[PDB]
Design a protein around this ligand. Structure first.
Ligand SMILES: [Zn+2]
Ligand SMILES: [Zn+2]
Ligand SMILES: [Zn+2]
Ligand SMILES: [Zn+2]
Lengths: 69, 69
C-alpha cells in the first residue's frame, strides 16, 4: 500500500544516515576526539587534521562499536 | 498489507538498536573509552565503572554526536 512506501522511505533514510559523510559507502565507526563528531568510516577519518563538521583539531580517532553495525 | 507489518517491525528494531541498552529510554550518545563500546545514554554511562559489553575498565566517557540523533 501507500503506507508500505512511506515506511520503506523512513527505513532508507535512517540507513543512509549511518553511512560515512565523505565516501557515502562504508558505515560510520569512528569518532573525532575531543569534539565527538562521529560521521566517518575508519579510512576517511584517518587523514583528516580537523573535524569536517566543526573544524576543531582532531587530537585522535576513537573506534566505535555500535549495536547497529 | 503483510509487508506493511514486516516493515514496521524492521523500523522498530532499528530504532530500538539506537536506544540505551541499560535504561531502554534514551538515545545512545556515549562511548566507553578505551574499549569503544557505544551502547549507553550519558546518564547510564556515567554510573558504570566497567563496560557492560566487555567488562573493561572505563577510563572515561566520550560524548558522540551522530547524524541519526
Ligand atoms: Zn568513508
Ligand atoms: Zn567536530
Ligand atoms: Zn540509559
Ligand atoms: Zn567495552
Amino acid at each position: 500500500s501507500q503506507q508500505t512506501r512511506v515506511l520503506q522511505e523512513k527505513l532508507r533514510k535512517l540507513k543512509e544516515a549511518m553511512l560515512c559523510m565523505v565516501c557515502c559507502e562504508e558505515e560510520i565507526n569512528s569518532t573525532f576526539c575531543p569534539c565527538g563528531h562521529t560521521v566517518c568510516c575508519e579510512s576517511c577519518a584517518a587523514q583528516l587534521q580537523s573535524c569536517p563538521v566543526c573544524r576543531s583539531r582532531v587530537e585522535h580517532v576513537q573506534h566505535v562499536y555500535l549495536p547497529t553495525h
